[PDB]
Amino acid sequence: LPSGSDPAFSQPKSVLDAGLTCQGASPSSVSKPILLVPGTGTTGPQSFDSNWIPLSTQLGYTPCWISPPPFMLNDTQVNTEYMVNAITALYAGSGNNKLPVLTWSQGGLVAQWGLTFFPSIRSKVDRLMAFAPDYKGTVLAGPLDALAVSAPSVWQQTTGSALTTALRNAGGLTQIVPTTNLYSATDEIVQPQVSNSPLDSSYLFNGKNVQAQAVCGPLFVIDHAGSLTSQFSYVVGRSALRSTTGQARSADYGITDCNPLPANDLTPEQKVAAAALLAPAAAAIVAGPKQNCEPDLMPYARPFAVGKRTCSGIVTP
């Protein structure tokens, strides 16, 4: 694990702060914040309005969220700066108290990239609840990279990207704070995920790796959005957020919780929005930025991906 000074932010603190919002509070004075880190092609709200914003509310958290522009499609390394700045702020804002981070898709990668590369936020996160995180990225990004039609962040979440190589090589496929990883075999966005083994994209060492089909059976299907919004995911999220250990406890759930439909503590209208969670992100992807190469790694990550090709060319330091 890196253990020096944090890297420099490439964004002005004012830009970063502007992407941080808290329900009914300013970050500088908030009780029991949880930070929500969105998936690819969405804003904080577009990810969590239909799910973890009300769910965290009812569990007695002040939901706060970052919305890195545009729709999490730019450089995961800059989307991470928004998350690091938010953790710094919300820790100080809550009386210097550790906060939980909850995340969907790339939000997980961003989180684990933060804890890998910016040591000062490890003493500020009491736990990480990653919903369908892509730590190895995914192989299903391959066709779109072959077309050279891919957002910066979609290059970086390709399996074998410089970014995913850099993370692994810096010791980033091991948990750095107590970490639960809810995910699904049937994820149509993130693969590989079928092994219920360290082969899976969502798997960390020492982490509470919950593959849905490992608890509910091989006849169980929740998809990429399902892994965030489902009653099953509520129960696992509830479990991790209340655990004295920082991790979901198998003691807290069972076979009768194997419900892939949106969380029952959402309103009927919330359920309907959560059901359709992914369409926004699919659309914002087809609407969004497009380049022919993977964004350069910033100097702090370059030593961990030597040999790989980014926009400037082959990585050397």
UniProtKB/Swiss-Prot annotation:
Disulfide bonds: C22-C64, C216-C258, C293-C311
Annotated keywords: Cleavage on pair of basic residues, Disulfide bond, Glycoprotein, Hydrolase, Lipid degradation, Lipid metabolism, Signal, Zymogen
Catalytic activity: a triacylglycerol + H2O = a diacylglycerol + a fatty acid + H(+)
GO biological process, one term: lipid catabolic process
Active-site residues (renumbered): S105, D187, H224
Keyword Hydrolase (UniProt): yes
Molecular function via GO: triacylglycerol lipase activity
Superkingdom of source: Eukaryota
Entry-listed glycosylation sites: N74
SUPFAM superfamilies hit by this protein: alpha/beta-Hydrolases
Listed EC numbers: 3.1.1.3
Function: Hydrolysis of triglycerides. Is very stereospecific both in hydrolysis and in organic synthesis and has a potentially important application in glucolipid synthesis.
Protein name (record): Lipase B
Biological source species: Pseudozyma antarctica
